[PDB]
Amino acid sequence: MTDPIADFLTRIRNANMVKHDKLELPASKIKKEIAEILKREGFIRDVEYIEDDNAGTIRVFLKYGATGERVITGLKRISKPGLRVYAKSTEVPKVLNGLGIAIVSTSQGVLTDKEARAKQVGGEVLAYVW
């Protein structure tokens, strides 16, 4: 319905608040890209792609630090169906003063803020996560 990426972010947010360890949801290309990015920056622990003959699903394990500390402290959606947001190469933002990351879809695929500013390319910003 309308926005699946917002549903993705809301699922991780709810599971993080509940201190859940495992999450599953239907899969797509952009969902797999977001999960792979989050795994690269270590926000999540692991991600698996389970094959079912409707669309396939993705399962992510939430990662918590020592003494039950939340690794992911917030997810915000920037681009929306009612208002799209596009950022230039010199307009890409720094999430949480460099402590967090942003996801941007540019002409070279999905990248983070560091990759986008390294190649001097721009795209549309999808979300902030910190």
Q: Where along the sequence are the contacts to RNA (CB under 7 A)?
A: 1-4, 6-7, 9-11, 13-15, 17-18, 20, 26, 28-30, 54-55, 77, 80-84, 86-90, 105-110, 120-124
- Specify the residue, 15 or 47, whose C-beta has the smaller distance to RNA: 15
| Identity at 34, one-letter amino acid code | I
What does the radius of gyration of the chain's CA atoms come to, in whole angstroms? 15
The candidate with the shortest Cα–Cα distance to 72, out of 34, 7, 129, is 129
CB of 60 to RNA, least distance (A): 13
Least separation in angstroms between residue 112's CB and RNA is: 14
Helices marked H in the chain: 4-18, 29-40, 113-119
**Smallest distance from the beta carbon of 19 to RNA, in angstroms?**
8
Nearer to RNA, 7 or 36 (CB): 7
Residue 92 near residue 122 (C-beta atoms within 8 A):
yes
Instruction: Give the integer Cα–Cα distance in Å for 94 and 86.
Output: 15
Amino acid at 81: P
Closest to RNA by CB, 20 vs 41, is: 20
Nearer to RNA, 42 or 91 (CB): 91
Minimum Å gap between C-beta 63 and RNA is: 18
